[PDB]
């Protein structure tokens, strides 16, 4: 559940991005964000 890559690798990146996309594509057990119960950041 933790994939690391360097922006400076002409090999692996795309395939590891695609493993990242694989790890991240299934979203059954993901909590949706709520506007209420949260304190929104100061718009600068």
């Amino acid at each position: 559940s933790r994939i690391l890559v360097s922006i400076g690798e002409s090999f692996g990146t795309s395939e590891k991005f695609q493993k990242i996309n694989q790890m991240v594509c299934n979203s059954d057990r993901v909590l949706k964000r709520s506007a209420e119960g949260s304190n929104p950041p100061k718009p600068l």
Binding site: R2, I3, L4, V5, S6, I7, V24, L31
Partner: protein
């Protein structure tokens, strides 16, 4: 016997790899020349219309990241959310959106 068989194999594989290394050598030299070429660099860009055919800012949101070399990207599947972390050891990183939405 098999010892000569393996020795003959080792010789084919040695010659093959020498050839591969040579081509890779030629290939990375082409890439090096491209990266030292000012006119190519100036012209090495994509439009917003380009990023569209692969994901258009009309239904989907598109984010462009530009970090210096060597910087780290961590993607995480939590119990409950997703995250991307970027850590640059030198230089600032740049992030922006696409105009059409």
């Amino acid at each position: 016997g098999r010892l000569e068989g393996l020795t003959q194999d080792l010789r084919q594989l040695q010659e093959s790899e020498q050839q591969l290394d040579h081509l890779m050598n030629i290939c990375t030299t082409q890439l090096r020349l491209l990266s030292e070429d000012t006119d190519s660099q100036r012209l090495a860009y994509v439009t917003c219309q380009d990023l569209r055919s692969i994901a258009d800012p009309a239904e989907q949101m598109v984010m462009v990241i530009k970090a210096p070399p060597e910087t780290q990207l961590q993607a995480v599947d939590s119990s409950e959310n997703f995250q991307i972390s970027l850590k640059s050891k030198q230089g600032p990183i740049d992030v922006f959106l696409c105009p059409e939405e």
